[PDB]
Amino acid sequence: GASLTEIEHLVQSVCKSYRETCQLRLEDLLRQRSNIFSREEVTGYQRKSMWEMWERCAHHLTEAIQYVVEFAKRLSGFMELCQNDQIVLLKAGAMEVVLVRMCRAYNADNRTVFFEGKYGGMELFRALGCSELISSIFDFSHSLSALHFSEDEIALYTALVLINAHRPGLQEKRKVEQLQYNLELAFHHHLCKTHRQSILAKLPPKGKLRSLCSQHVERLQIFQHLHPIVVQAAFPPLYKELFSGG
Amino acid sequence: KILHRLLQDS
Ligand SMILES: CCc1cc(O)c2ccccc2n1
Numbered sequence: 001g002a003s004l005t006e007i008e009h010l011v012q013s014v015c016k017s018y019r020e021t022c023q024l025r026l027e028d029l030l031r032q033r034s035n036i037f038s039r040e041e042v043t044g045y046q047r048k049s050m051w052e053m054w055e056r057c058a059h060h061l062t063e064a065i066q067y068v069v070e071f072a073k074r075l076s077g078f079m080e081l082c083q084n085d086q087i088v089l090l091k092a093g094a095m096e097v098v099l100v101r102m103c104r105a106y107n108a109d110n111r112t113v114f115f116e117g118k119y120g121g122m123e124l125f126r127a128l129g130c131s132e133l134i135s136s137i138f139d140f141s142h143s144l145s146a147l148h149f150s151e152d153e154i155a156l157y158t159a160l161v162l163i164n165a166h167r168p169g170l171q172e173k174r175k176v177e178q179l180q181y182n183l184e185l186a187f188h189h190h191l192c193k194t195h196r197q198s199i200l201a202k203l204p205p206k207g208k209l210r211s212l213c214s215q216h217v218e219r220l221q222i223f224q225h226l227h228p229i230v231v232q233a234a235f236p237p238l239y240k241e242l243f244s245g246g
Numbered sequence: 247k248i249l250h251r252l253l254q255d256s
Pocket residue numbers: 139140143144201202203204205208
């Protein structure tokens with residue numbers, strides 16, 4: 001039973017937790033927009049082996065996930081849930097938060113994403129052999145970029161993506177519903193205060209984030225069948241914990 | 247293993 005004063009404190013707390021756990025400052029990503037991979041560099045990426053490209057991408061995803069774990073740990077009320085629930089929420093939601101955070105590193109003007117120090121198009125990722133997954137992620141990032149999120153809106157929205165009381169496996173489901181309700185109030189209060197309530201209808205449905213995560217696990221399984229020793233010997237242990245089952 | 251360690255490391 002949170003009050004208006006407590007709701008405003010929650011807004012500031014979430015926004016602070018987010019700013020502290022950004023891998024890249026938004027200003028740094030915007031200032032790098034003219035730093036684009038040349039045609040020779042794109043060709044170099046396309047000539048990389050499928051296994052080398054998968055390992056590089058899994059490493060980059062793992063680094064991004066580590067920041068999401070830290071965001072969760074700083075998130076008001078998350079560390080108060082039992083460890084089983086903390087792990088359920090991170091296993092189901094870490095990739096979804098990374099997918100939303102990715103729109104900051106996406107330049108809708110030329111359809112490029114910041115990857116390994118420069119901006120490149122989806123053609124940079126051709127060696128992975130998961131064209132449908134890559135194009136869906138780029139489409140998703142393009143659609144989110146059209147919302148023109150502020151950093152505070154991403155902070156509030158990503159807190160809600162993570163604190164989802166519907167995840168299967170939660171033991172303290174009511175405690176999570178209460179935290180989710182308070183974060184929903186904080187988010188909707190901020191939108192109301194900044195006259196941005198129009199974005200509510202424009203946010204992706206939860207099924208969209210679920211579809212993208214499911215496609216990622218499916219393409220990982222195909223790669224794992226082709227190069228099992230690459231996954232075992234060369235994929236990050238956190239990545240295997242979240243997406244292979246250890 | 248990893249997730250438990252990250253969550254415990256204060
Ligand atoms: C109009 C609702 C809607 C539906 C989607 O699939 C979206 C996908 C990405 C971003 C925003 C989205 N918004």
